[PDB]
Design a protein around this motif. Sequence first.
Motif, PDB file in Angstrom:
ATOM      1  N   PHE A   9      33.392  39.049 -45.298  1.00  0.00           N
ATOM      2  CA  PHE A   9      33.805  37.790 -44.642  1.00  0.00           C
ATOM      3  C   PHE A   9      33.951  36.756 -45.592  1.00  0.00           C
ATOM      4  CE2 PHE A   9      31.772  39.023 -40.072  1.00  0.00           C
ATOM      5  CZ  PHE A   9      32.983  40.079 -39.972  1.00  0.00           C
ATOM      6  N   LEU A  13      37.197  34.784 -46.730  1.00  0.00           N
ATOM      7  CA  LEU A  13      37.259  33.310 -46.316  1.00  0.00           C
ATOM      8  C   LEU A  13      37.598  32.440 -47.623  1.00  0.00           C
ATOM      9  CD1 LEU A  13      34.181  32.945 -43.940  1.00  0.00           C
ATOM     10  CD2 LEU A  13      36.526  32.556 -43.261  1.00  0.00           C
ATOM     11  N   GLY A  49      29.129  36.846 -38.604  1.00  0.00           N
ATOM     12  CA  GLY A  49      29.875  35.379 -38.427  1.00  0.00           C
ATOM     13  C   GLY A  49      28.810  34.177 -38.109  1.00  0.00           C
ATOM     14  N   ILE A  52      26.810  33.369 -41.294  1.00  0.00           N
ATOM     15  CA  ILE A  52      27.634  32.655 -42.120  1.00  0.00           C
ATOM     16  C   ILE A  52      27.891  31.281 -41.648  1.00  0.00           C
ATOM     17  CG2 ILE A  52      30.052  32.274 -43.005  1.00  0.00           C
ATOM     18  CD1 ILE A  52      30.149  35.244 -43.656  1.00  0.00           C
ATOM     19  N   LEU A  53      28.296  30.921 -40.375  1.00  0.00           N
ATOM     20  CA  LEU A  53      28.268  29.750 -39.754  1.00  0.00           C
ATOM     21  C   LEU A  53      26.965  28.985 -40.071  1.00  0.00           C
ATOM     22  CD1 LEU A  53      29.732  27.525 -38.040  1.00  0.00           C
ATOM     23  CD2 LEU A  53      29.030  28.681 -36.015  1.00  0.00           C
ATOM     24  N   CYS A  56      26.771  28.204 -43.811  1.00  0.00           N
ATOM     25  CA  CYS A  56      27.550  26.991 -44.333  1.00  0.00           C
ATOM     26  C   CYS A  56      26.987  25.655 -43.848  1.00  0.00           C
ATOM     27  CB  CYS A  56      28.838  27.227 -43.716  1.00  0.00           C
ATOM     28  SG  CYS A  56      29.981  28.653 -44.176  1.00  0.00           S
ATOM     29  N   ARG A  63      33.524  24.393 -41.476  1.00  0.00           N
ATOM     30  CA  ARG A  63      34.627  25.185 -41.132  1.00  0.00           C
ATOM     31  C   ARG A  63      34.914  25.354 -39.616  1.00  0.00           C
ATOM     32  NH1 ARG A  63      38.335  25.962 -44.469  1.00  0.00           N
ATOM     33  NH2 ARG A  63      37.434  23.925 -44.903  1.00  0.00           N
ATOM     34  N   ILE A  68      36.428  31.770 -38.825  1.00  0.00           N
ATOM     35  CA  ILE A  68      35.459  32.685 -39.014  1.00  0.00           C
ATOM     36  C   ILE A  68      35.569  33.723 -37.782  1.00  0.00           C
ATOM     37  CG2 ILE A  68      33.628  31.424 -39.952  1.00  0.00           C
ATOM     38  CD1 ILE A  68      32.502  30.754 -36.948  1.00  0.00           C
ATOM     39  N   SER A  72      35.975  38.111 -38.525  1.00  0.00           N
ATOM     40  CA  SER A  72      35.116  38.788 -37.719  1.00  0.00           C
ATOM     41  C   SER A  72      36.047  39.053 -36.331  1.00  0.00           C
ATOM     42  CB  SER A  72      33.933  37.766 -37.312  1.00  0.00           C
ATOM     43  OG  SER A  72      33.153  38.752 -36.353  1.00  0.00           O
TER      44      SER A  72
END
Length: 121
Positions: A9, A13, A49, A52-53, A56, A63, A68, A72
């Motif tokens: 991912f 991204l 996912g 990662i959120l 970040c 984002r 995302i 995903s």
Amino acid sequence: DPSLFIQHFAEKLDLADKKIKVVKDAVKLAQRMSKDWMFEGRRPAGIAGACILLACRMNNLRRTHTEIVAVSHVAEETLQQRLNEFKNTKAAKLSVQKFRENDVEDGEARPPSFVKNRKKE
DNA sequence: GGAAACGGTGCTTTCTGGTAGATATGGCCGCAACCGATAGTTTAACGGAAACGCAGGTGATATGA
């Protein structure tokens, strides 16, 4: 394991030079949530996912849900459900801020899986 | 004591006609051989049957999506 999904991912991204920091924070988030029991019987692409959120967010970079959920396979409502679930964990709003706090212990884990039945009774 | 004269007919000879095998030449009949043709494999490669795997008429237990 989730490590492969977050690496792929991050690679697709291509956020910024911060990719390594994002992946490392996502590994720590995935490990902590797994120790909070919030991974057994659940989708690898969803945990990746959400981690990662959160990574970040911890790295102060913004984002959209649309990017995302492009990498995903899970739907935006699943990401939001998991985000709200993370936010309800022990001391979440008291530890989600800056300085990357050392709190990793499980305490008592209370996932929706049995808590829905506890509410129904 | 015998040899020389020569009559007997037994034994033999060519001239010939007979017996009858032989074959240069001839005309049918059919064997040895070739180019010819029909039938043969088993597979290019994909048309076929039998061999092959998932659906739909209920139901519906979980807790995530």
